[PDB]
Amino acid sequence: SDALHIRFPDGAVIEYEPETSALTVSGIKTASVTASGSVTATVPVVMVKASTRVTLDTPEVVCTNRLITGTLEVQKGGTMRGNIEHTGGELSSNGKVL
Amino acid sequence: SDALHIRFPDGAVIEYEPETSALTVSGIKTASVTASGSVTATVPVVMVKASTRVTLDTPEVVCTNRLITGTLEVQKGGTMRGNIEHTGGELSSNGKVL
Amino acid sequence: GSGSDALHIRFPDGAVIEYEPETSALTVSGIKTASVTASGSVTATVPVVMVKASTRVTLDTPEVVCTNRLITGTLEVQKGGTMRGNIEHTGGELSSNGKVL
Numbered sequence: 001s002d003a004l005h006i007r008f009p010d011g012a013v014i015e016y017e018p019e020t021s022a023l024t025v026s027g028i029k030t031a032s033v034t035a036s037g038s039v040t041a042t043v044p045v046v047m048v049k050a051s052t053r054v055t056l057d058t059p060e061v062v063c064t065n066r067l068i069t070g071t072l073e074v075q076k077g078g079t080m081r082g083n084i085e086h087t088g089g090e091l092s093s094n095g096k097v098l
Numbered sequence: 099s100d101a102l103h104i105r106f107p108d109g110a111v112i113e114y115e116p117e118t119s120a121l122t123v124s125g126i127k128t129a130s131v132t133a134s135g136s137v138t139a140t141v142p143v144v145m146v147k148a149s150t151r152v153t154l155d156t157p158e159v160v161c162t163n164r165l166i167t168g169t170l171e172v173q174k175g176g177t178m179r180g181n182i183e184h185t186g187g188e189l190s191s192n193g194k195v196l
Numbered sequence: 197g198s199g200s201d202a203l204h205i206r207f208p209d210g211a212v213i214e215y216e217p218e219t220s221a222l223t224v225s226g227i228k229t230a231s232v233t234a235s236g237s238v239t240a241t242v243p244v245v246m247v248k249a250s251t252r253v254t255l256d257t258p259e260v261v262c263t264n265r266l267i268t269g270t271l272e273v274q275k276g277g278t279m280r281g282n283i284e285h286t287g288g289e290l291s292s293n294g295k296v297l
């Protein structure tokens with residue numbers, strides 16, 4: 001083919017717009033992608049806007065460079081290498097400030 | 099169009115069901131999206147079930163609120179701001195339990 | 197048989213949306229933006245997920261949950277947190293409010 005605009009009876013749309021080179025899927029309830037090898041996205045900016053939660057259910061999540069978070073909870077321990085600088089509050093272990 | 103059930107000769111299927119508003123992609127080995135600008139997903143729940151690994155290969159991963167993990171490995175240092183509460187084990191640095 | 201359908205769309209901007217049954221590869225290329233908007237959930241189930249983003253990946257959500265291990269190059273925690281279990285620091289200095297501990 002050379003065009004893609006599908007509008008479904010529930011109001012969902014799957015479309016590709018060449019004028020702005022924009023692929024859109026909208027108005028759906030669920031999507032599920034099952035693959036036996038890999039799923040890859042290669043693009044400068046990825047935005048995941050999830051009003052409930054993003055779950056990465058995997059043995060390993062790897063962030064290759066920087067990871068920034070508002071708050072952190074580590075449930076079962078870990079390791080830190082390099083310089084770790086804490087500021088702007090109290091660092092405590094088993095109820096004892098350091 | 100207004101319907102979608104594509105059944106490929108390798109057993110893969112791409113389909114949309116408007117009564118449940120469900121988009122399904124199944125039976126594939128790999129998927130990839132390559133874009134020059136951005137990829138966005140807007141949905142309350144994002145679920146990634148990756149039996150080997152999820153890699154976020156990027157200068158920066160930003161979690162805008164809370165991040166929860168089982169275990170943590172920081173390879174090249176970092177900064178922590180605010181109150182940091184350690185409990186339920188030993189916090190050690192360069193071999194010494196604080 | 198398993199099916200006889202095909203998917204190969206080449207658009208005037210050079211984008212391609214196709215499925216290649218020879219390698220079972222679904223490919224979208226040559227686009228500028230993609231967006232998926234859903235009211236319930238999106239699931240991907242696959243051994244390997246690779247997100248190769250030369251600027252940034254933002255997870256704009258109340259909570260990101262990594263069910264097992266999280267590995268990062270550097271870490272920046274902006275507004276506090278909790279760490280449970282054994283935490284081992286090596287290979288540098290852990291400093292709090294200016295004091296090397």
Ligand SMILES: CCCCCCCCCCCCCCCCCCCC(=O)O[C@H](COC(=O)CCCCCCCCCCCCCC)COP(=O)(O)OCCN
Pocket residue numbers: 001003004005006014025031032033039040041048054099102104112121123129130131137138139144146203205213214222223224230231232238239240245247
């Ligand atoms: C935490 C972040 C990391 C994990 C989550 C993000 C992962 C990012 C990478 C995802 C890669 C999977 C998606 C591959 C491309 C799918 C879309 C191309 C296929 C396509 O448009 O086919 C049309 C039907 O719609 C379709 O086939 C629509 C299928 C859409 C599948 C994707 C559903 C959402 C899954 C989550 C990933 C989405 C990321 C954003 C793209 C064909 O139409 P036709 O044959 O009738 O045309 C003929 C004329 N009419």
